[PDB]
Design a protein around this ligand. Structure first.
Ligand SMILES: C[C@@H](OP(=O)(O)O)C(=O)O
Ligand SMILES: C[C@@H](OP(=O)(O)O)C(=O)O
Lengths: 231, 231
């Protein structure tokens, strides 16, 4: 088998891609996903590829594997925009990040806090910081009700109606259309983060072949469906 | 005494401010600075205030202190822009971030890798990602010769002529006019990160008083000299 490990998020596109690849080639490709702690020990034994939902988080995770992976070999392949996910129907009429700072709303953001490797780390401050207004930054931060360890944790909190807004990625909405209503972030504030892959040292030909497939016309189309861009 | 702990960088402004404050009020204020590992054990016992050079890093650091600190009380007070520091004279004629992607250059950037709490984490990808061009992101990344655990480490590497460009903050340049040549980052790409403070639970009046002083006219002006802004 070709075994991939990485965070929830890119996993939906990857599962579709792996399925199509397996149908075509006969090579069994397994997409393991979730918080790092849930698969780390098994991945140490059989990981062929580590995929990431951002560069900083991918660097962190790959580093944890020691000499089994050479972190210089992380390959960015696609990117997607951050979004604001509101409760279905957007009851508070949220219109962007500045609006979030101005209104009395509960925001949930994933932040690693140096003890979790999550695509979210640094995102909210980099976006709202581009307003170049300390009051706005303060107000926004004052509305954050929870800094959670990963996107999965934010999803759970959000689904339990404990937050009005979740700072996340377009793909989370594309993968879960019914869970909330996506609101686009100001183009002058938004950040775009990448999907990446890294093959283990001594990766098999089959593993390398699948990596190549991630750049095929067929894979690009699947990625596009989930909001991942090049372009 | 009032004891502060945090990263190098904001320390230059804080030193000037503390000096002025102590002379004026007679209250002694100590500014301890550097990589978290160098002062963590001591801070555990007498840190009155933790200051930060970004939100994600400050959240990380404060979270390491258990109930002694409440992370919901982190207060952003100023911000400043990321810059490119080139070797003296800017011999490669670097004009911005896109230039660092298109030219053959050696870049150093601080990235925590989930094991160091540094202001740099997520910065480079958030800036270059705003080009919305995967080739550009790839090209920029390919030029990164070193990810380092903190700004101080980048400074050392830069000083040894090991890199052509260091992704850093304006305050590092202002604090060290002798080191390199600052190049402004494209307005549509640049990120701004914050200086912040959090007082320990049960903070003394002296501690509260100094926190207030950080927002005084005299404090604002000193921060301004080092590139720290409010609006
Ligand atoms: C790891 C996490 O995704 P991230 O927090 O990296 O977006 C997840 O949802 O499994
Ligand atoms: C901690 C580090 O600063 P940072 O890496 O947070 O910019 C330093 O140089 O002391």
């Amino acid at each position: 088998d070709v075994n991939l490990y990485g965070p929830g998020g890119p996993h939906t596109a990857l599962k579709d891609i792996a399925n199509k690849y397996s149908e075509k080639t006969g090579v069994k490709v397994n997409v393991n996903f979730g918080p790092q702690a849930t698969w780390f020990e098994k991945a140490k034994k059989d990981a062929d590829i580590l995929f990431g939902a951002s560069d900083q988080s991918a660097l962190a995770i790959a580093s944890d594997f020691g000499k089994d992976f050479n972190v210089s070999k992380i390959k960015p392949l696609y990117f997607r925009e951050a979004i604001i996910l509101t409760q279905k129907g957007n009851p508070l009429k949220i219109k962007g990040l500045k609006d979030l700072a101005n209104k009395k709303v509960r925001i949930v953001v994933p932040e690693g806090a140096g003890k979790s490797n999550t695509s979210g780390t640094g995102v909210w401050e980099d976006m709202i910081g581009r307003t170049q207004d300390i009051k706005t930054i303060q107000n926004f931060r004052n509305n954050i009700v929870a800094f959670v360890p990963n996107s999965g944790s934010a999803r759970k909190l959000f689904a339990q109606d404990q937050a009005d807004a979740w700072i996340t990625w377009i793909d989370w909405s594309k993968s879960n259309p019914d869970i909330g209503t996506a609101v686009a972030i100001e183009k002058d504030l938004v950040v775009y983060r990448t999907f990446n892959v890294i093959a283990k040292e001594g990766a098999s030909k089959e593993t390398q072949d699948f990596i190549a497939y991630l750049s095929s016309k067929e894979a690009k189309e699947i990625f596009k469906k989930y909001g991942w861009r090049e372009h």
